[PDB]
Amino acid sequence: FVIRGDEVRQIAPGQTGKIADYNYKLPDDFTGCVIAWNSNNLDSKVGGN
Amino acid sequence: ALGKLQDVVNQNAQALNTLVKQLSSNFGAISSVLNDILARLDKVEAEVQ
């Protein structure tokens, strides 16, 4: 999925906030790798995407 | 006169009052009260306290 860079801190086990609680809840015992990169060269537009 | 029997009573009361007074201790946690910990902290931090 795609999100705003400031919000990426919520993509970790046991977090809280609008992304964590209304969009994508990781379990507290998550086993896995969270991988992320800036995509402004693909996902961004003048006047807004 | 009955010092040995009163001593056995007093030692069991001293042991139980000690066992209950130990609920008031922090043991290094932010508070000695679980509902205070559970109100101050988010899940992953509350679990450590």
From Swiss-Prot, chain B:
Recorded coiled-coil stretches:
6-49
Q: What is the effect of changing residue 38 to F?
A: In strain: Omicron/BA.1
Going by the entry's taxonomy, the superkingdom of the source organism is recorded as Viruses
- Protein function: Subunit of the fusion protein that is processed upon entry into the host cell. Mediates fusion of the virion and cellular membranes by functioning as a class I viral fusion protein. Contains a viral fusion peptide that is unmasked after S2 cleavage. This cleavage can occur at the cell membrane by host TMPRSS2 or during endocytosis by host CSTL. In either case, this triggers an extensive and irreversible conformational change that leads to fusion of the viral envelope with the cellular cytoplasmic membrane, releasing viral genomic RNA into the host cell cytoplasm.
Descriptive protein name: Spike protein S2'
Please state the gene responsible for encoding this protein: S
